[PDB]
Symmetry: D2
Subunit: 295 residues, 4 copies
Amino acid sequence: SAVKAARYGKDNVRVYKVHKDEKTGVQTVYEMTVCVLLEGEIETSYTKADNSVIVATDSIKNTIYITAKQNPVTPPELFGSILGTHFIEKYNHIHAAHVNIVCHRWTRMDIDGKPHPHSFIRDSEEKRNVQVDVVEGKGIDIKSSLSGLTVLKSTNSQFWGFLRDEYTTLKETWDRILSTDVDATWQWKNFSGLQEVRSHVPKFDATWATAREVTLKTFAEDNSASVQATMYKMAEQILARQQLIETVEYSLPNKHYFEIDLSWHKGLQNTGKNAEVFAPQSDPNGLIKCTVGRS
Amino acid sequence: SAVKAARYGKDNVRVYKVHKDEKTGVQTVYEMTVCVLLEGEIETSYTKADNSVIVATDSIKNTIYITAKQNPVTPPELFGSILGTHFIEKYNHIHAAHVNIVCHRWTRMDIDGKPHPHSFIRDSEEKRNVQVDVVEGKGIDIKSSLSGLTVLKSTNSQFWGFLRDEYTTLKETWDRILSTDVDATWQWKNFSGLQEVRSHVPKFDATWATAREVTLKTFAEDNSASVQATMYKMAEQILARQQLIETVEYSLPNKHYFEIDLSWHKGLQNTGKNAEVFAPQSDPNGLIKCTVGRS
Amino acid sequence: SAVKAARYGKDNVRVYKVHKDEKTGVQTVYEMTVCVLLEGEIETSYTKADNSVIVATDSIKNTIYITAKQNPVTPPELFGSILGTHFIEKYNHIHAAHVNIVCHRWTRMDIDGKPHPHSFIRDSEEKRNVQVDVVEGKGIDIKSSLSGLTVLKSTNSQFWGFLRDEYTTLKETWDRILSTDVDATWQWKNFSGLQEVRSHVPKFDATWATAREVTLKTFAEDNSASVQATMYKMAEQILARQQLIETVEYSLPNKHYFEIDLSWHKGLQNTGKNAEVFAPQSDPNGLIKCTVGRS
Amino acid sequence: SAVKAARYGKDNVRVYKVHKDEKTGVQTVYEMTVCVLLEGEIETSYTKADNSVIVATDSIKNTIYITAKQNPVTPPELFGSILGTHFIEKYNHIHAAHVNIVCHRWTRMDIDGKPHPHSFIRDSEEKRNVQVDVVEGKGIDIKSSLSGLTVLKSTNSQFWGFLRDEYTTLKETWDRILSTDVDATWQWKNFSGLQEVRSHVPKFDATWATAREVTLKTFAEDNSASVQATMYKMAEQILARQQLIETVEYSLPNKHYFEIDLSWHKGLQNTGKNAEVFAPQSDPNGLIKCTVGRS
Ligand SMILES: O=c1[nH]c(=O)c2nn[nH]c2[nH]1
Ligand SMILES: O=c1[nH]c(=O)c2nn[nH]c2[nH]1
Ligand SMILES: O=c1[nH]c(=O)c2nn[nH]c2[nH]1
Ligand SMILES: O=c1[nH]c(=O)c2nn[nH]c2[nH]1
Ligand code: NA
Ligand code: NA
Ligand code: NA
Ligand code: NA
């Protein structure tokens, strides 16, 4: 037997950082969960009990805090690139670092219509994420994403004209509820190293904001022929607005809301045009994916 | 042996309702999870296998949908009172109904600064809840609550002057992070029945809004001497603003963020006045409760 | 306004303890999650920002570890009583302690048919719990429970003869699946203090074991007329076997498995006597409770 | 823009099946959660709103139940292969099916030392899983796994001799707790189609059983030099015992239990050789992975 692949490191490292403006008294907080996994010439720790090649996972944890102390933590694409680069430069025998960051929302509170200097609210479990792969001699690959964005529209969704055979019971419809949890990922062109990532810093927050806006607007305005058709429209627009993105991937559950036939009870009408009360279904759910790239 | 207490019914009944304004084209959605438990002369179903006294839990589920079809579902205090009253009036041998409702957020989307007519977003897992106990001959007891409101302030919290003995390691502090998940419940004066609940309908949404506002403002503005002292200020204000509330109860975790001493690494300064990077602690957590009533 | 009730302390304190037999080399592990909440003359911490009355929640955490170091942690009824008694005796102004303990399973591994001296497996998320209320001048009240015991029987459950009216669609049945998650609590007679709890130590593990055995056997062997009827049989037996128990409470979800009509597809028969494939339902669920005491 | 990849289908389809032996009266239950995602010539549903190419996800759900009705559901490697093959053969334009199955434990109850004919218990959340990829013209690729196997050993784990630099605070140790949740996957050699999968049916359950046994025994008996070294020993043995496996992958968290220094309190000794009470850490955790193949 032989080691074909190996990676190890520290997961679920929670980190908070505060920035204090002395001039204005305004404070800004950031909170993330970080995972760092390393690869390189470490096979002997598995095969020969040779720990001399192991940077302890405990040390990886220390490094994350030290790096957060000495560097900006935003945008997360930059912080992840700094963190991954550190490991491949510091250790001769480590050749790849894989950094995953989940950013948690702490939105400044408005009190009496004024932004509060140091109080924050968690408005939704929506996350902004990055995956950064730093590979020695091959640059920096960054995937940025948003996840946990939960939306619903109560009309202007249709689904008809699908394949019908002996397995099909689903009725065609011209008016249904559409609800999903959005997971959207945009993959950046490969960067040559940290200097190049730094050169594009302003694009990261702007592209996140654009991706979010395009997702929300398209969902709200499309008279949707299917999840497939609406998601493609979203991806097409993001690619048009940011030339440095190579691909956009969406993964969308179709969270079903079923009509409830109440006609057995005093002829009560609650289906089709008379449908008012529905039963949200926890499971099963449709799952629709697509990856869109350039011609 | 004897049956000392018994209750049974249906839990986790998910319900969605849409309202469609034909004049404006605007749609509004409501989504809840409902639990209904009944009590009454049902002991024989346990002791003698006498099912004749059982209103099937499946029928309770049907009733929830039918009731939602025929009545407004907002405010939830009203819907819960209608639902509970139904069971005690319809069935001679059922003498109490206990209705719990959790309301989920579906907030209308703003697209290009305009409210969208039929598209919604789940902005946070914060819930609005009610517990309604309808007891034959004793009226309607309603407890309203908000839960899952997660907040953090980065300064203007202190904790000093506590008891110190041989069990104490905690250092006094004049500047710390304070973060919590708010669970706040206000208990209404007993209502004589449905007519009286109907007479107070406008107070329900207004009092929820007030409770939320007072919680957020007091948290943001108090230079907090402790969780205990700040929560009492909140409760005092809610009681002052709504005479029909008898008691206010808060249950607050103290979600700790620990300083990280980095001085072992090149004398890096990250404690006290130099603290920038902290470690959020998943557990354990302080838990502080209080119930405030009128003199 | 006035403080009507207040309690505070530390929740989610995870504790592991190992016992090492030097003679045999055998090791035994215990892992728990502990919550301690205190009450007493502490109103001024809420109303006057008087922290001098507060035993810091951090100190409560320290106390839990120190107490676990100096005392046996099993049975949990004893450990909880020691822990609660500590607070009311040590602090003049603390008059009640409320201790909740959740015990996690670490079952010794069998390797080649022999019990291993120091290796353990988590066989199921079933928990053994205690709630201990220690109140100055009123003794020690203990509620013991098991929870998270998930069972299913594929036949020998019936449900017919229930009330039928205009809200009823459920068909009567003489053969169905019955599945539940068992939550069972037995409440001990009040104990005068720690000496009396110590005197009954052997009864705690024995009664837990009996409660579990009676639950499993009755579930498996009863040709069940309803959840109500089967649960009553369980409670009756536990009360008969342990005279020091005053009441037994069961809370049981009815986790539904629905038949799937497949007759639309080539006349496939999958209902009633031909039912083989079913759809487990995540929600809603029946919820049936009862508390049984002595005549 | 162009569609680079697309797949869609139904997730979270819960299925239960009962087998009834008429001769013995013994019943056996199976419960799974199934996901099926399809690929093929479906790009136009995304780009042109052409639903004619879509096999509705609702129909995929129906198919899963019908297939379970007409075929054995065990071993899951066989059921997944039957299910995936169905879609690529039935639909000309579907060229790949991806089937994921999670099998839930329902272990027959022992009542009075005898196996019960129709009563079952969920002994642990450990799962047995399969991933089956059926690709037209390329055969059947099967990955089998176990997950959610949670173990702990209280001694006979060491960790010393790792890299020490200016980022390192971890002390070397010759005696620590080791606890993990095992995720282990074995990948079968490619099969040419369903006939070949059928020919190897007895190997599936046997290899699962072997993988489990080797994992438990090696964990219990190895005087572990690191997670890395112990996991490699496991993988090596599985590959030696089943020639039809090509690779074995383990992914193991290192769930830390920290010593608690109590010496500040009356010189209490609770570290090193005197360590009895520990604090389990919820996060962060080490994460160690490896994939082992043949020379
Ligand atoms: O077994 C271990 N492997 C590791 O890589 C490691 N790093 N810190 N502690 C550890 N323990
Ligand atoms: O055992 C049951 N008890 C009940 O009260 C009930 N109601 N519907 N189905 C049921 N099954
Ligand atoms: O606000 C607080 N209240 C308390 O009771 C406490 N105990 N430790 N830290 C604390 N902070
Ligand atoms: O938008 C949808 N896409 C689908 O593929 C599908 N299948 N069933 N319902 C559906 N809705
Ligand atoms: Na390197
Ligand atoms: Na009545
Ligand atoms: Na006292
Ligand atoms: Na095909």
